[PDB]
Amino acid sequence: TIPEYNDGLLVPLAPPIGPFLPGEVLLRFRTYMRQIDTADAAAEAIDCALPQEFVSWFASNAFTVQSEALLLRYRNTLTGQLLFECKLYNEGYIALSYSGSGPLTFPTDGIFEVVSWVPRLYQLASVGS
């Protein structure tokens, strides 16, 4: 949550990460940090929208947009299995049409490949928990 930027006052800051079409959740990248912990023993997961090498590789080559989202296509580099299909919205975050209840983790040894530009209303194929 937003820390204290002023001492008690309001500041300028980026807008919330939205909005989504009905049925889409936020694809999260997950890393675990170092934590001082008196009682618990689990890992403190922090979540980001895009990792580095994506925030670089942007602002180094400046692309245009031409539409409201990019339809990516995550597939594993071995056997060419298609893991899922996501929408990289033009505001630098990935939406993924998942209608389950709990989490659903994917393997991290595939490569995102841009397929096309898709409008805001495009309807992704559901993923299966």
Partner: protein
């Protein structure tokens, strides 16, 4: 302006017949493919079109060595992502116009296909159709580049055997000038397709081709991160009083990726 230089190295009658371009490969491709008639109208500098002759070079050094292709034109190296094939000749200009005090001669040969690559000593670069040009010549030296070939067309992937154009420092570079400096004649290479160059078969234009010269990121070297310790970069510099050939292990990568 002064004409105590060499007027023009007008292309000698190099011993070579005329070679057919797109007239042989036309009834064997299933498309009618033409390229902009304005690309044939000006000489633009090659991608590999910059060399230099210093006086530390010796007779025999290979100044430039560039195979006939579409890699000889920024225009056609870009158009050759959409096609799979090409045929035809090119016309190359060689711009060395060194000082009035320099002296020396380069020899530009026309190496055929399948000739073994490697040494190409100075005793044998003259056995090819060649042009011996002084490094003081004023006006550019137009010299051809024929598509001597065994097949109808070449595929736009560099494993082709195609006619090279080797240039070799024939006599060394010296200067009469009375003061404490030897000039470094720096030549350039300009090129334009001949009258019957042609590409063959429109294909999806893919960026990751054998052409597409290296690009670097537009990021300042002070926002970059270090490759040997987790910190920013606080200044690039050149120091001659250090280990000159170090054996570091991190941040060491070929340009071709590995």
């Amino acid at each position: 302006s002064g004409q105590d230089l060499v007027p023009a190295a007008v292309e000698q009658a190099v011993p070579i017949q005329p070679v057919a371009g797109a007239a042989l490969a036309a009834p064997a491709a299933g498309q009618i493919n033409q390229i902009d008639p304005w690309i044939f109208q000006n000489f633009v500098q090659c991608p590999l079109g910059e060399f230099s002759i210093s006086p530390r070079n010796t007779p025999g050094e290979i100044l430039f060595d560039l195979a006939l292709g579409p890699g000889l034109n920024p225009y056609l190296a870009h158009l050759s992502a959409m096609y799979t094939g090409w045929v035809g000749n090119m016309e190359v200009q060689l711009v060395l116009a060194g000082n009035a005090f320099t002296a020396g001669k380069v020899v530009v040969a026309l190496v055929p296909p399948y000739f073994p690559k490697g040494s190409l000593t100075t005793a044998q670069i003259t056995c090819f159709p060649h042009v011996m040009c002084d490094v003081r010549t004023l006006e550019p030296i137009q010299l051809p580049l024929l598509d001597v070939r065994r097949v109808l067309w070449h595929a736009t992937q560099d494993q082709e055997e195609s006619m090279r154009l080797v240039c070799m420092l024939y006599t060394p570079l010296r200067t009469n000038s009375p003061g404490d400096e030897s000039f470094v004649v720096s030549g350039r290479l300009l090129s334009k397709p001949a009258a019957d160059f042609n590409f063959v078969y429109l294909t999806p234009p893919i960026e990751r081709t054998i052409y597409r010269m290296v690009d670097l990121p537009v990021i300042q070297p002070r926002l970059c991160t270090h490759a040997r310790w987790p910190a920013p970069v606080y200044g690039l510099l050149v120091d001659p009083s250090l280990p000159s050939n170090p054996q570091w292990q991190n941040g060491r990568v070929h340009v071709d990726g590995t």
